[PDB]
Amino acid sequence: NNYDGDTVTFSPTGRLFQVEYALEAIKQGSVTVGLRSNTHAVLVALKRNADELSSYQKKIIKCDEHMGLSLAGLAPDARVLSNYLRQQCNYSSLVFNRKLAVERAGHLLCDKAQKNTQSYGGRPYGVGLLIIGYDKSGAHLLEFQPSGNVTELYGTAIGARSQGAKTYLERTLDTFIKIDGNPDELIKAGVEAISQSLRDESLTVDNLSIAIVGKDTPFTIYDGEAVAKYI
């Protein structure tokens, strides 16, 4: 109200409204789902078009051979943050000959986003990210919020109507975690999860975006006729 003019101002109840408004931009964004087993981690994203002449906005970005994310909210902010992850993954490899741990990647994103919430002049990031990866401790899935909060999960969803997919994953938890050594079934579970968030529209060939990383599987993105198999 009087305390939402900038990010440097607490409200009387201890809230940061600019951060909360940035969180609101994610809710307007298109739905994206993340889930993993012990061998693989999968991203599924519903891409959004402007109209029938336009292309469908890409949702998934590769960060390294073993890591990548999906976005919901301001796409340019995802480009900035993914670029930062690319550099950090790259610094780890060049200097230490070491693939960056997914947990450490989450810590770096948290700290970068935090600086934008405590200083004058700047603004919070207006995007939410779902990071998947396979490192020395197996498969991982992270959820990033531009408040700075990063959380490691078995499965989750962000964006508009993401609550439907999140409940489904909460039911299916015991099933999909056991899908080891079977990429197609893990993606099926993700495609079925994101379907719980659809209304009026359904998953078409240029609508659906899928990404997977695993034990002997580099981070690869599937679009177009490559996802027709799962429709």
Binding site: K62, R86, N90, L94
Partner: protein, 222 residues
Amino acid sequence: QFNPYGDNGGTILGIAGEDFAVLAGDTRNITDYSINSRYEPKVFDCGDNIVMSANGFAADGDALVKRFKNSVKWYHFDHNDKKLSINSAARNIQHLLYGKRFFPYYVHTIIAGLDEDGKGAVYSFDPVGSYEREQCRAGGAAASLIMPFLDNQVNFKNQYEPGTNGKVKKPLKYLSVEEVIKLVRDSFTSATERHIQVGDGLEILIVTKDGVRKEFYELKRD
């Protein structure tokens, strides 16, 4: 006074075929009159069907290869996983080298692969980034021993057709991958005999449309 440069010896050789390319190099690494390693790989697969070797001062050689491999990675990120063509890689390497014009990478760089028409390609660089596409190029310690032999046996220089006595040249017939590998092995065997910094092992990377294959051969260890 501190000398930031050193000489790790070694010798490399690139030959472009009709639908293939080879980049070879000995595996010996030295300083002065000592052997550091009998097997230290010098020719690297950099992705996108491109092989590279930066021969001379090994620290600069490793740094350059490392920065080029990195440039391939970022080329994919920035341009929608587009394949970096050999001519584009060559121009990129010129800028990496010329960036340190006034404190140069003390190396002789050679890359090999296939051009956009599928034909064999070899590019050669000096330490400060001047480059040129070539059919044949040796680099490093025994380059002066090897190049004349390749002028004669690959390009048929000073060879004419019997009976004509200098009137008709020997026609420039194309060489198979098996033929090129024979010339590479004989080049390094001969270089090993007469050059003290050449020996131990020979590693050849062969590039075709199918990908990058490796071959290793023993060289004399004295």
